[PDB]
Amino acid sequence: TSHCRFYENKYPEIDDIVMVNVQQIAEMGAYVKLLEYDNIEGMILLSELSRRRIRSIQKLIRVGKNDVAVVLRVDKEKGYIDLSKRRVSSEDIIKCEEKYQKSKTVHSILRYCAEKFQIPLEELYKTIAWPLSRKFGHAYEAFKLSIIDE
RNA sequence: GGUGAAAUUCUUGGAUUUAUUGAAGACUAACUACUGCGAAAGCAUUUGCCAAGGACGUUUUCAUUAAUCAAGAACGAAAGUU
Ligand SMILES: [Mg+2]
Ligand SMILES: [Mg+2]
Ligand SMILES: [Mg+2]
Ligand SMILES: [Mg+2]
Ligand SMILES: [Mg+2]
């Protein structure tokens, strides 16, 4: 079960870049799920969805696929996000790519660990990934070190 | 910044705005109007100098010296050329 968000808390921060998989589209916008963080839903509105004039949404969004975005407002009581998509700079997307790729590696490795040990990812992340992220900022550099220095 | 909306561009070597100032070059807002001057272009900050001009007033002076003009000439917006 893929849960237990990458970061040390399940909620977003006010300015961050993130990457999102679209789940559906409504008329006012799309309330979609975050993948840089665990599962929390939030709106992306059509007015702040496309760069150019919004002529089509099917071509741009491509529901079921991965896109870059940022977060502007946060609901820190029960969980709701306001996100943005047009304000992604040419430099933003590159670092979003690298951050999501390292996160995806560290997620798939420990997902395999959970599947082979049949223990929820929450406990495994709390026991292993979190202290390593505390110590060296991200667990992937720790994995590289463990390859080199044990 | 900018735009229908964006992007290019400048920014924690702190831009955008904030106060004093300093430099440069342009130009003369509002007053500015069915208003003025000039042959036409054109002419709008102040002051001085330089000469010029229309209009009016004139019981001033000369007495046709005038009108339009091929040839010839003077100015001639903007742009452009040394
Ligand atoms: Mg300043
Ligand atoms: Mg003036
Ligand atoms: Mg006048
Ligand atoms: Mg002639
Ligand atoms: Mg010239």
PDB file of C-alpha atoms (C1' of nucleotides) and ligand atoms in Angstrom:
ATOM      1  CA  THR A   1       0.000   0.000   0.000  1.00  0.00           C
ATOM      2  CA  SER A   2       1.621   3.219  -1.255  1.00  0.00           C
ATOM      3  CA  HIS A   3       0.997   5.822   1.453  1.00  0.00           C
ATOM      4  CA  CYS A   4       2.979   7.615   4.173  1.00  0.00           C
ATOM      5  CA  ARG A   5       4.210  10.698   2.265  1.00  0.00           C
ATOM      6  CA  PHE A   6       7.844  11.235   1.277  1.00  0.00           C
ATOM      7  CA  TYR A   7       8.380  14.304   3.459  1.00  0.00           C
ATOM      8  CA  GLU A   8       8.189  14.502   7.247  1.00  0.00           C
ATOM      9  CA  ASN A   9       4.565  15.716   7.169  1.00  0.00           C
ATOM     10  CA  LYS A  10       1.536  14.835   5.053  1.00  0.00           C
ATOM     11  CA  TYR A  11       0.620  18.429   4.123  1.00  0.00           C
ATOM     12  CA  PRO A  12       2.118  20.931   1.655  1.00  0.00           C
ATOM     13  CA  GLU A  13       3.867  24.264   2.118  1.00  0.00           C
ATOM     14  CA  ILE A  14       3.067  27.686   0.704  1.00  0.00           C
ATOM     15  CA  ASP A  15       5.252  28.199  -2.454  1.00  0.00           C
ATOM     16  CA  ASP A  16       6.567  24.673  -3.164  1.00  0.00           C
ATOM     17  CA  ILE A  17       6.831  22.994  -6.555  1.00  0.00           C
ATOM     18  CA  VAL A  18       5.204  19.566  -6.889  1.00  0.00           C
ATOM     19  CA  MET A  19       4.164  17.027  -9.514  1.00  0.00           C
ATOM     20  CA  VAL A  20       0.624  15.735  -9.933  1.00  0.00           C
ATOM     21  CA  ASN A  21      -1.284  12.897 -11.583  1.00  0.00           C
ATOM     22  CA  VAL A  22      -4.690  14.005 -12.846  1.00  0.00           C
ATOM     23  CA  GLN A  23      -7.699  11.897 -11.881  1.00  0.00           C
ATOM     24  CA  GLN A  24     -10.665  13.707 -13.474  1.00  0.00           C
ATOM     25  CA  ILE A  25     -11.851  17.094 -14.765  1.00  0.00           C
ATOM     26  CA  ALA A  26     -14.930  19.091 -13.735  1.00  0.00           C
ATOM     27  CA  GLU A  27     -16.316  22.259 -15.314  1.00  0.00           C
ATOM     28  CA  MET A  28     -14.812  24.735 -12.830  1.00  0.00           C
ATOM     29  CA  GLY A  29     -11.530  22.825 -12.608  1.00  0.00           C
ATOM     30  CA  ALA A  30      -9.950  19.546 -11.539  1.00  0.00           C
ATOM     31  CA  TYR A  31      -9.617  18.342  -7.938  1.00  0.00           C
ATOM     32  CA  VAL A  32      -6.613  16.035  -8.321  1.00  0.00           C
ATOM     33  CA  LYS A  33      -4.202  14.057  -6.130  1.00  0.00           C
ATOM     34  CA  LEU A  34      -0.632  15.009  -5.242  1.00  0.00           C
ATOM     35  CA  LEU A  35       2.210  12.527  -5.768  1.00  0.00           C
ATOM     36  CA  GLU A  36       5.143  14.535  -4.414  1.00  0.00           C
ATOM     37  CA  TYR A  37       3.126  14.121  -1.208  1.00  0.00           C
ATOM     38  CA  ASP A  38       0.993  11.143  -0.305  1.00  0.00           C
ATOM     39  CA  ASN A  39      -2.632  11.462  -1.434  1.00  0.00           C
ATOM     40  CA  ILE A  40      -4.227  14.800  -0.493  1.00  0.00           C
ATOM     41  CA  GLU A  41      -6.600  16.298  -3.067  1.00  0.00           C
ATOM     42  CA  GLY A  42      -6.677  19.882  -4.339  1.00  0.00           C
ATOM     43  CA  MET A  43      -8.052  22.118  -7.088  1.00  0.00           C
ATOM     44  CA  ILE A  44      -6.324  23.312 -10.220  1.00  0.00           C
ATOM     45  CA  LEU A  45      -8.557  25.862 -11.944  1.00  0.00           C
ATOM     46  CA  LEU A  46      -8.847  26.310 -15.704  1.00  0.00           C
ATOM     47  CA  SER A  47      -7.877  29.995 -15.506  1.00  0.00           C
ATOM     48  CA  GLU A  48      -4.546  28.908 -13.967  1.00  0.00           C
ATOM     49  CA  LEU A  49      -4.171  25.611 -15.879  1.00  0.00           C
ATOM     50  CA  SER A  50      -2.775  26.337 -19.357  1.00  0.00           C
ATOM     51  CA  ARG A  51      -0.100  28.794 -20.428  1.00  0.00           C
ATOM     52  CA  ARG A  52      -1.735  29.955 -23.666  1.00  0.00           C
ATOM     53  CA  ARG A  53      -5.462  30.429 -24.257  1.00  0.00           C
ATOM     54  CA  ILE A  54      -7.408  27.435 -22.930  1.00  0.00           C
ATOM     55  CA  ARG A  55      -8.741  26.015 -26.180  1.00  0.00           C
ATOM     56  CA  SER A  56      -8.713  22.359 -25.094  1.00  0.00           C
ATOM     57  CA  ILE A  57      -8.287  20.598 -21.758  1.00  0.00           C
ATOM     58  CA  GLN A  58      -8.086  17.017 -23.009  1.00  0.00           C
ATOM     59  CA  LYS A  59      -4.936  17.749 -25.024  1.00  0.00           C
ATOM     60  CA  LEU A  60      -3.246  19.702 -22.226  1.00  0.00           C
ATOM     61  CA  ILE A  61      -4.110  17.855 -19.016  1.00  0.00           C
ATOM     62  CA  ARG A  62      -4.136  14.274 -20.379  1.00  0.00           C
ATOM     63  CA  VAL A  63      -5.852  12.753 -17.340  1.00  0.00           C
ATOM     64  CA  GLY A  64      -3.957   9.769 -15.955  1.00  0.00           C
ATOM     65  CA  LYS A  65      -0.575  11.345 -16.781  1.00  0.00           C
ATOM     66  CA  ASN A  66       2.037  13.306 -14.843  1.00  0.00           C
ATOM     67  CA  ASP A  67       2.445  17.097 -14.840  1.00  0.00           C
ATOM     68  CA  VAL A  68       4.308  19.819 -12.953  1.00  0.00           C
ATOM     69  CA  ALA A  69       2.539  22.309 -10.675  1.00  0.00           C
ATOM     70  CA  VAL A  70       2.943  24.545  -7.627  1.00  0.00           C
ATOM     71  CA  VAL A  71       0.834  25.192  -4.523  1.00  0.00           C
ATOM     72  CA  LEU A  72      -0.502  28.615  -3.502  1.00  0.00           C
ATOM     73  CA  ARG A  73      -2.947  28.029  -0.623  1.00  0.00           C
ATOM     74  CA  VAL A  74      -3.329  25.230   1.919  1.00  0.00           C
ATOM     75  CA  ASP A  75      -6.172  23.977   4.126  1.00  0.00           C
ATOM     76  CA  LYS A  76      -4.482  22.726   7.309  1.00  0.00           C
ATOM     77  CA  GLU A  77      -7.604  21.484   9.135  1.00  0.00           C
ATOM     78  CA  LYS A  78      -8.910  18.499   7.137  1.00  0.00           C
ATOM     79  CA  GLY A  79      -6.825  18.677   3.949  1.00  0.00           C
ATOM     80  CA  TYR A  80      -7.421  20.705   0.791  1.00  0.00           C
ATOM     81  CA  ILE A  81      -5.009  22.299  -1.675  1.00  0.00           C
ATOM     82  CA  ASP A  82      -5.106  25.218  -4.085  1.00  0.00           C
ATOM     83  CA  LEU A  83      -2.578  24.677  -6.871  1.00  0.00           C
ATOM     84  CA  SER A  84      -1.270  26.446  -9.962  1.00  0.00           C
ATOM     85  CA  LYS A  85       0.032  25.230 -13.313  1.00  0.00           C
ATOM     86  CA  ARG A  86       0.706  28.235 -15.571  1.00  0.00           C
ATOM     87  CA  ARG A  87       3.252  29.650 -13.166  1.00  0.00           C
ATOM     88  CA  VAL A  88       5.838  26.932 -13.763  1.00  0.00           C
ATOM     89  CA  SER A  89       9.059  28.541 -14.959  1.00  0.00           C
ATOM     90  CA  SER A  90      11.373  26.939 -17.502  1.00  0.00           C
ATOM     91  CA  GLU A  91      13.792  26.225 -14.641  1.00  0.00           C
ATOM     92  CA  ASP A  92      11.068  24.921 -12.303  1.00  0.00           C
ATOM     93  CA  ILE A  93      10.196  21.866 -14.403  1.00  0.00           C
ATOM     94  CA  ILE A  94      13.781  20.559 -14.480  1.00  0.00           C
ATOM     95  CA  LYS A  95      14.229  20.505 -10.706  1.00  0.00           C
ATOM     96  CA  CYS A  96      10.713  19.097 -10.376  1.00  0.00           C
ATOM     97  CA  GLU A  97      11.816  16.271 -12.687  1.00  0.00           C
ATOM     98  CA  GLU A  98      14.917  15.459 -10.651  1.00  0.00           C
ATOM     99  CA  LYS A  99      13.145  15.728  -7.288  1.00  0.00           C
ATOM    100  CA  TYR A 100      10.295  13.469  -8.386  1.00  0.00           C
ATOM    101  CA  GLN A 101      12.722  10.972  -9.915  1.00  0.00           C
ATOM    102  CA  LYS A 102      14.769  10.591  -6.728  1.00  0.00           C
ATOM    103  CA  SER A 103      11.554  10.453  -4.683  1.00  0.00           C
ATOM    104  CA  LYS A 104      10.145   7.780  -7.008  1.00  0.00           C
ATOM    105  CA  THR A 105      13.287   5.678  -6.629  1.00  0.00           C
ATOM    106  CA  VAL A 106      13.248   5.931  -2.830  1.00  0.00           C
ATOM    107  CA  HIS A 107       9.508   5.144  -2.903  1.00  0.00           C
ATOM    108  CA  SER A 108       9.717   2.088  -5.171  1.00  0.00           C
ATOM    109  CA  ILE A 109      12.610   0.571  -3.200  1.00  0.00           C
ATOM    110  CA  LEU A 110      10.765   0.765   0.111  1.00  0.00           C
ATOM    111  CA  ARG A 111       7.495  -0.267  -1.557  1.00  0.00           C
ATOM    112  CA  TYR A 112       9.272  -3.458  -2.598  1.00  0.00           C
ATOM    113  CA  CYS A 113      10.504  -3.765   0.989  1.00  0.00           C
ATOM    114  CA  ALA A 114       6.949  -3.467   2.325  1.00  0.00           C
ATOM    115  CA  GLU A 115       5.574  -5.918  -0.242  1.00  0.00           C
ATOM    116  CA  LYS A 116       8.251  -8.516   0.540  1.00  0.00           C
ATOM    117  CA  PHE A 117       7.794  -8.069   4.304  1.00  0.00           C
ATOM    118  CA  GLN A 118       3.999  -7.479   4.247  1.00  0.00           C
ATOM    119  CA  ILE A 119       4.259  -4.619   6.762  1.00  0.00           C
ATOM    120  CA  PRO A 120       2.611  -1.209   6.173  1.00  0.00           C
ATOM    121  CA  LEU A 121       4.836   1.427   4.590  1.00  0.00           C
ATOM    122  CA  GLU A 122       4.072   3.815   7.470  1.00  0.00           C
ATOM    123  CA  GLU A 123       6.138   1.926  10.049  1.00  0.00           C
ATOM    124  CA  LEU A 124       8.946   1.173   7.589  1.00  0.00           C
ATOM    125  CA  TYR A 125       9.222   4.841   6.602  1.00  0.00           C
ATOM    126  CA  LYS A 126       9.128   5.958  10.243  1.00  0.00           C
ATOM    127  CA  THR A 127      11.896   3.477  11.115  1.00  0.00           C
ATOM    128  CA  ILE A 128      14.278   3.959   8.176  1.00  0.00           C
ATOM    129  CA  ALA A 129      13.538   6.708   5.658  1.00  0.00           C
ATOM    130  CA  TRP A 130      12.759   9.513   8.116  1.00  0.00           C
ATOM    131  CA  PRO A 131      16.027   9.426  10.147  1.00  0.00           C
ATOM    132  CA  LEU A 132      18.058   9.194   6.934  1.00  0.00           C
ATOM    133  CA  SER A 133      16.234  12.192   5.459  1.00  0.00           C
ATOM    134  CA  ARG A 134      16.883  14.014   8.734  1.00  0.00           C
ATOM    135  CA  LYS A 135      20.602  13.221   8.635  1.00  0.00           C
ATOM    136  CA  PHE A 136      21.482  13.776   4.968  1.00  0.00           C
ATOM    137  CA  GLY A 137      18.483  15.667   3.600  1.00  0.00           C
ATOM    138  CA  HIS A 138      17.422  12.778   1.355  1.00  0.00           C
ATOM    139  CA  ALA A 139      17.658   9.006   1.620  1.00  0.00           C
ATOM    140  CA  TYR A 140      19.032   8.440  -1.896  1.00  0.00           C
ATOM    141  CA  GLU A 141      22.445   9.895  -1.032  1.00  0.00           C
ATOM    142  CA  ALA A 142      22.382   7.616   2.012  1.00  0.00           C
ATOM    143  CA  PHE A 143      21.684   4.659  -0.295  1.00  0.00           C
ATOM    144  CA  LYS A 144      24.654   5.653  -2.463  1.00  0.00           C
ATOM    145  CA  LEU A 145      26.812   5.874   0.657  1.00  0.00           C
ATOM    146  CA  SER A 146      25.589   2.461   1.846  1.00  0.00           C
ATOM    147  CA  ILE A 147      26.715   1.213  -1.559  1.00  0.00           C
ATOM    148  CA  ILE A 148      30.117   2.781  -0.843  1.00  0.00           C
ATOM    149  CA  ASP A 149      30.407   3.342   2.930  1.00  0.00           C
ATOM    150  CA  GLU A 150      28.383   1.169   5.308  1.00  0.00           C
TER     151      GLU A 150
ATOM    152  C1'   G B   1       7.764  45.494 -16.437  1.00  0.00           C
ATOM    153  C1'   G B   2       3.939  44.475 -19.621  1.00  0.00           C
ATOM    154  C1'   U B   3      -0.469  42.665 -21.683  1.00  0.00           C
ATOM    155  C1'   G B   4      -6.824  40.579 -24.173  1.00  0.00           C
ATOM    156  C1'   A B   5      -3.895  37.009 -21.678  1.00  0.00           C
ATOM    157  C1'   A B   6       1.151  35.816 -21.542  1.00  0.00           C
ATOM    158  C1'   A B   7       6.193  35.538 -22.409  1.00  0.00           C
ATOM    159  C1'   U B   8      11.321  38.224 -23.464  1.00  0.00           C
ATOM    160  C1'   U B   9      13.817  41.662 -19.511  1.00  0.00           C
ATOM    161  C1'   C B  10      15.599  43.623 -14.176  1.00  0.00           C
ATOM    162  C1'   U B  11      16.015  41.713  -9.372  1.00  0.00           C
ATOM    163  C1'   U B  12      18.189  39.381  -1.466  1.00  0.00           C
ATOM    164  C1'   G B  13      25.490  42.200  -5.538  1.00  0.00           C
ATOM    165  C1'   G B  14      18.671  43.945  -3.061  1.00  0.00           C
ATOM    166  C1'   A B  15      15.651  45.758  -8.319  1.00  0.00           C
ATOM    167  C1'   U B  16      10.111  48.162  -8.446  1.00  0.00           C
ATOM    168  C1'   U B  17       8.931  51.814  -5.746  1.00  0.00           C
ATOM    169  C1'   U B  18      11.147  56.223  -0.982  1.00  0.00           C
ATOM    170  C1'   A B  19      13.293  61.041   0.089  1.00  0.00           C
ATOM    171  C1'   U B  20      16.842  64.727  -1.077  1.00  0.00           C
ATOM    172  C1'   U B  21      19.907  66.218  -4.791  1.00  0.00           C
ATOM    173  C1'   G B  22      23.503  66.166  -9.472  1.00  0.00           C
ATOM    174  C1'   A B  23      24.366  65.420 -15.175  1.00  0.00           C
ATOM    175  C1'   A B  24      22.685  65.433 -20.139  1.00  0.00           C
ATOM    176  C1'   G B  25      19.649  66.505 -24.186  1.00  0.00           C
ATOM    177  C1'   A B  26      14.860  67.489 -25.949  1.00  0.00           C
ATOM    178  C1'   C B  27      10.581  70.289 -25.430  1.00  0.00           C
ATOM    179  C1'   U B  28       7.503  74.380 -23.896  1.00  0.00           C
ATOM    180  C1'   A B  29       1.796  70.996 -20.575  1.00  0.00           C
ATOM    181  C1'   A B  30      -2.420  73.189 -18.138  1.00  0.00           C
ATOM    182  C1'   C B  31      -3.722  78.984 -20.190  1.00  0.00           C
ATOM    183  C1'   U B  32      -5.165  76.790 -25.879  1.00  0.00           C
ATOM    184  C1'   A B  33     -10.543  79.006 -28.265  1.00  0.00           C
ATOM    185  C1'   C B  34     -15.004  77.654 -35.042  1.00  0.00           C
ATOM    186  C1'   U B  35      -8.657  83.050 -31.199  1.00  0.00           C
ATOM    187  C1'   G B  36      -3.710  85.809 -33.289  1.00  0.00           C
ATOM    188  C1'   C B  37       0.749  86.697 -36.795  1.00  0.00           C
ATOM    189  C1'   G B  38       2.985  85.388 -41.455  1.00  0.00           C
ATOM    190  C1'   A B  39       3.879  85.046 -48.773  1.00  0.00           C
ATOM    191  C1'   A B  40       3.451  79.843 -48.076  1.00  0.00           C
ATOM    192  C1'   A B  41       5.852  76.399 -45.328  1.00  0.00           C
ATOM    193  C1'   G B  42       5.252  77.611 -40.170  1.00  0.00           C
ATOM    194  C1'   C B  43       5.088  80.172 -35.435  1.00  0.00           C
ATOM    195  C1'   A B  44       3.368  79.015 -27.961  1.00  0.00           C
ATOM    196  C1'   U B  45       8.695  79.782 -21.203  1.00  0.00           C
ATOM    197  C1'   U B  46      10.994  84.874 -19.494  1.00  0.00           C
ATOM    198  C1'   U B  47      14.057  89.315 -20.711  1.00  0.00           C
ATOM    199  C1'   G B  48      17.194  92.398 -23.773  1.00  0.00           C
ATOM    200  C1'   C B  49      18.976  93.810 -28.551  1.00  0.00           C
ATOM    201  C1'   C B  50      18.210  93.787 -33.941  1.00  0.00           C
ATOM    202  C1'   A B  51      15.566  95.213 -38.011  1.00  0.00           C
ATOM    203  C1'   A B  52      10.718  94.180 -40.444  1.00  0.00           C
ATOM    204  C1'   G B  53       4.972  94.108 -41.023  1.00  0.00           C
ATOM    205  C1'   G B  54      -0.444  94.227 -41.406  1.00  0.00           C
ATOM    206  C1'   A B  55      -4.732  97.170 -39.577  1.00  0.00           C
ATOM    207  C1'   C B  56      -6.554 102.004 -37.922  1.00  0.00           C
ATOM    208  C1'   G B  57      -6.092 107.629 -37.493  1.00  0.00           C
ATOM    209  C1'   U B  58      -4.322 111.628 -40.873  1.00  0.00           C
ATOM    210  C1'   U B  59      -7.706 119.059 -43.923  1.00  0.00           C
ATOM    211  C1'   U B  60       0.481 115.283 -44.556  1.00  0.00           C
ATOM    212  C1'   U B  61       3.361 114.383 -49.245  1.00  0.00           C
ATOM    213  C1'   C B  62       4.239 112.318 -55.255  1.00  0.00           C
ATOM    214  C1'   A B  63       0.570 112.225 -59.010  1.00  0.00           C
ATOM    215  C1'   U B  64      -0.753 106.661 -62.436  1.00  0.00           C
ATOM    216  C1'   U B  65       4.086 105.385 -60.253  1.00  0.00           C
ATOM    217  C1'   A B  66      -0.907 100.283 -61.254  1.00  0.00           C
ATOM    218  C1'   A B  67      -3.317  94.489 -61.807  1.00  0.00           C
ATOM    219  C1'   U B  68      -1.767  89.626 -63.531  1.00  0.00           C
ATOM    220  C1'   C B  69       2.442  87.613 -65.124  1.00  0.00           C
ATOM    221  C1'   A B  70       6.364  83.374 -70.286  1.00  0.00           C
ATOM    222  C1'   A B  71      12.042  84.305 -68.973  1.00  0.00           C
ATOM    223  C1'   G B  72      14.307  84.737 -64.463  1.00  0.00           C
ATOM    224  C1'   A B  73      14.592  84.620 -59.093  1.00  0.00           C
ATOM    225  C1'   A B  74      13.829  84.189 -52.748  1.00  0.00           C
ATOM    226  C1'   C B  75      11.713  80.965 -49.141  1.00  0.00           C
ATOM    227  C1'   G B  76       9.752  75.965 -49.178  1.00  0.00           C
ATOM    228  C1'   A B  77       6.773  70.691 -43.718  1.00  0.00           C
ATOM    229  C1'   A B  78       8.577  65.778 -42.897  1.00  0.00           C
ATOM    230  C1'   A B  79      11.783  62.384 -44.753  1.00  0.00           C
ATOM    231  C1'   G B  80      16.579  61.939 -47.014  1.00  0.00           C
ATOM    232  C1'   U B  81      22.332  63.282 -48.276  1.00  0.00           C
ATOM    233  C1'   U B  82      27.716  65.233 -46.989  1.00  0.00           C
TER     234        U B  82
HETATM  235 MG    MG C   1      15.986  51.174  -4.208  1.00  0.00          MG
HETATM  236 MG    MG C   2       3.511  77.101 -21.612  1.00  0.00          MG
HETATM  237 MG    MG C   3      -3.757  85.434 -29.068  1.00  0.00          MG
HETATM  238 MG    MG C   4       7.194  81.100 -63.756  1.00  0.00          MG
HETATM  239 MG    MG C   5      16.010  66.458 -40.747  1.00  0.00          MG
END
